[PDB]
Symmetry: D2
Subunit: 274 residues, 4 copies
């Protein structure tokens, strides 16, 4: 339970952020849900309400997490309404696509990619710090296996932003634990959300993709494509001092086993000898 | 909840294994607790009973996990009494000490060390496999930060056994997930248990040690020495398909942040310039 | 030998870059040395000339690696004077300081730190590619143990920039190898150079700091503080396709063993028991 | 040069060891080559003689590295003929096969796999130490990408033995460096040698297998299967204190980029959408 806890979940107007928000709410938390898409943000709110959570325990904020005023709005409204902040979930993120790929992607794409997936995390962390230390709270960042240890050459900026995020999780974890706040992270593998849709893929195509990798053991050993709730459960676990108190500055990989398979292992000996 | 689940926790006559066993039991599991020390095994049983768990839901077995007959006894009695096996927790382990240290420790110490911390894990895994696949169960191994990434030159065999364990967790996870069983692990940092006592340290000395590292931020950033329950909570989380289903073949580090600190970082710039 | 090889070493006006430059030159390579400080760049040129290398083999360029103008001059002058580019070593880097520390360092320091330690690498890589694939050349990046696996909470942006670099090395390595160009990196530990001076420390304080860590085994196990040449040697090995041809997208750690020591290991058992 | 250097290369009767042996010899070192197969050991000696090296510089010893008798002969003959030992390269190793696979391989295969790939290293290290600290020598271990970070479920014991080796390299490196001896390692990926033959594959099948993976970029990004010399080169670099002096307790990965590819990346987006 997170009864009474004030929780801020960035990027909760869809996917992982949404699931996490409903879980926190079902666990008795006062949650600040936010995003840019007003319709989807409303959908998240309705799912929480449908869960039997009173409207006063929900603070929906329409904002761009990369904008200073948007960040301030998210934080100020949660403070005004809940009077404190216990947990910060830096979940908002995306693999920004402009049509280019590989090392040829423009630096402008690099700037925007880092602006969202990294700089915004720094800013939310800095602006939330003082409040988290007054409650001896938590921070849970949402990284990705795209950070490594394998190469993700098709989209280096997104991959490197996450890699930067991981070391930021470790740095802020060791610095902030001094003041009583724990910092950890989750590195998801493939998760069927609106992620590919945001990259430009029609629902029909994103579905085909998630379905394909979810059925190929060399893609996802576990036998199914990740679901938002599966990642949300681990974000919640890491946000629960009572259960994960001894875990500090770590990002637990949740990829159904994807990173445990090499490209060379997709061929079996026999078939190669034929 | 683990209502009805059949759980085998090796090394549950003390420390982490004990805590995990009581948690599983409190969660409604039928637990097989085992060890070599009859008195301590009984103490674990009593703690479970004191928790309000009926005696029929407890299978206490006195055995040496490195002995074939001991392993068989553990497995057979749990099958006879519970009729199935859902979770295997390879927790039994120890840093065997014979008075020597560093690369000079004898190979005989290496053989015994691996016999317990590694070979016994292989054997329990092989003998439990078929039953775990009939229930599409779980395996949770208990490794250690002594496996790396830092060197632990004072006791190379214990350190290397754990390192071997980690790759075994990954290997068996990818091989066994094909048949529906998930395999993960936990790599604890310092935990105040009977661990140092088993190495030859009197309770008074082990207490002084755990107390010292628990109060030095450069030793354990979190501000306290690990408690068995803190590691147990994560073993339980990993044993819960419903919550950690997408985590496969991973060992989550729980060391209060110890491995995040370098030896060179124990000196601050100013004091060095003085 | 690098006879018939055109090499560009950014940040070769001092420290590691300087050493790398003199070795490449001694091995018969046409070398382009660069930096912002003309006095020190001249000193580098001087050491190369003293090594018996003819002036027509050395192309000194004053430039700011973060400015497009500087980048273009570095590349164009080499192409104009040497007609091609075989090796590019992204050595330029620094832990920018503004007096602030920890998670409190301003985003402005972040932006400047990344522009130098990461964006400059992206840009030099993008602008040199074409010529490197022309000669089936090499790329050697210089990172730092500051990227991980330990936390470096005092200067997060410098740490995270290096963490991003490492994933960039991997991404470009896998992307550019299909065009015949190898990408690798070296992650140095502490090395007595002008690094600390650039941070604001007078030579006396710098020498003191370096001497101290070089004499404490819990700081640098190898027994001495690293010297520029020790890192230059491995940069040269990685730049020599004839010798390291099978190493791809890797960053070899050269820290005299620093990352192999935990902060907790700085205290021996007996000291604690008293 | 290794002029005035006495070098022991276990497993130098074939593959990587053979290549390493010829290079060391070409660099003017007194070399001790060893193996069990006298025919192949002779072939190694022959290549060294053909390289212009005098017979008094080469000490061929027939021995089983897993037997104390063999270990003592390897060491004593070198000391008797060359008077000292400067470098020890633990190259001997093999993925022992008995027809079984996966987590089902018997503990008996485990014991044999570890005795060769791990215990033999412990023993050679313990028995050579004294002489290595006498000359402030080097130790280079040969591991494998088989240790991780990916799973290698088909042959767990060989994989785990290498994982144990890596932590042993780190432990002994930090322990032996205080006595002036450097310990490092190289983790090769696929390399066309007699490795597959030892596993039971006829030369034709072996050549086919090696050619296949060397031509598929998702298998070996670099474009070719590794050759013994490519690994020997890095072993020699690590054995050359004059060049790698600052590298301690590290195992550089030389797999032509294999570990940088995920099984999921073997499928491109467009192929999936159709
Ligand atoms: N899906 C996958 O396979 C993986 C996802 N991840 C991580 O998960 C997160 C994304 O969620 P899913 O993963 O659920 O993605 P979508 O389901 O892609 O969710 C994106 C979320 O973040 C928000 N967001 C994106 N950019 C901005 C912005 N500039 N300002 C405010 N909000 C923004 C979206 O808001 P709305 O659209 O209004 O803007 C939305 O709530 C990222 O941190 C991502 O890296 C990591 C690994 C794999
Ligand atoms: N304590 C710490 O700081 C850390 C502990 N760990 C891991 O935790 C586990 C040990 O528990 P704690 O950690 O709680 O240790 P103790 O509290 O040391 O518990 C040891 C447990 O394992 C059992 N055990 C040991 N050897 C054998 C054997 N041959 N046959 C049967 N049972 C055996 C003991 O049985 P009884 O004594 O009868 O025999 C007991 O239940 C190991 O896996 C260890 O590596 C990992 C990192 C840190
Ligand atoms: N020293 C250490 O302990 C470690 C160093 N490293 C890496 O080594 C590199 C730094 O070299 P040393 O290590 O030799 O450092 P200094 O000896 O600090 O050398 C810095 C070098 O880079 C150049 N440089 C810095 N900023 C710029 C800029 N904006 N434009 C052009 N050139 C610039 C300097 O040129 P001049 O000042 O004219 O501009 C100089 O040649 C970095 O990549 C750093 O991260 C990694 C780990 C440890
Ligand atoms: N080939 C590959 O793709 C990879 C190889 N490696 C490592 O390379 C080494 C093997 O060499 P290649 O790689 O050249 O293999 P083979 O070409 O397989 O060479 C095996 C070598 O070790 C010796 N050897 C094996 N078992 C014993 C024993 N019991 N006693 C004495 N010598 C023994 C052989 O001697 P002879 O048979 O007389 O006994 C021979 O010189 C191992 O350490 C292996 O793990 C790591 C990764 C990949
Ligand atoms: C890197 N890439 C990200 C997350 C896993 C993988 C597949 C996908 O669909 C999006
Ligand atoms: C390696 N060593 C093990 C576990 C953490 C560290 C301290 C201790 O007391 C026992
Ligand atoms: C790697 N090395 C460490 C931390 C940053 C850099 C400079 C120094 O003096 C100590
Ligand atoms: C590293 N390399 C991989 C797996 C084991 C070894 C032999 C081979 O042919 C492929």
């Amino acid at each position: 339970r997170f009864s009474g806890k004030s929780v801020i979940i960035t990027g909760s107007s869809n996917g992982i952020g949404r699931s996490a928000a409903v879980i926190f709410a079902k666990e008795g938390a006062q949650v600040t849900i936010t995003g840019r898409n007003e319709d989807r943000l409303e959908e998240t709110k309705q799912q929480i309400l449908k869960a039997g959570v009173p409207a006063e325990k929900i603070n929906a904020v329409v904002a761009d997490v990369t904008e200073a005023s948007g960040q301030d709005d998210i934080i100020n409204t949660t403070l005004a309404k809940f009077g404190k902040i216990d947990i910060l979930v830096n979940n908002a993120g995306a693999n920004l696509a402009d049509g280019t790929a590989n090392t040829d992607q423009p630096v402008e794409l690099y700037q925007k990619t880092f602006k969202l997936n990294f700089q915004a995390v720094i800013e939310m962390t800095q602006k939330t710090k003082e409040h988290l230390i007054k409650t001896k709270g938590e921070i849970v960042n949402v990284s990705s296996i795209v950070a490594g240890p394998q190469a993700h050459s098709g989209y280096p900026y997104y991959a490197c932003a996450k890699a930067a995020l991981d070391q930021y999780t470790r740095c802020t974890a060791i610095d902030l634990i001094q003041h009583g706040v724990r910092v950890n992270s989750v590195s998801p593998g493939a998760v069927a959300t609106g992620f590919m849709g945001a990259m430009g893929l029609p629902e029909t195509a994103s579905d085909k993709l998630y379905s394909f990798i979810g059925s190929r053991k060399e893609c996802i050993p576990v036998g199914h494509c990740g679901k938002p709730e599966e990642i949300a459960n681990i974000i919640v676990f890491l946000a629960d001092r009572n259960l994960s108190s001894y875990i500090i500055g770590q990002s637990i990989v949740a990829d159904g086993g994807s990173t445990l398979v090499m490209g060379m292992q997709t061929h079996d000996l026999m078939s190669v000898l034929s």
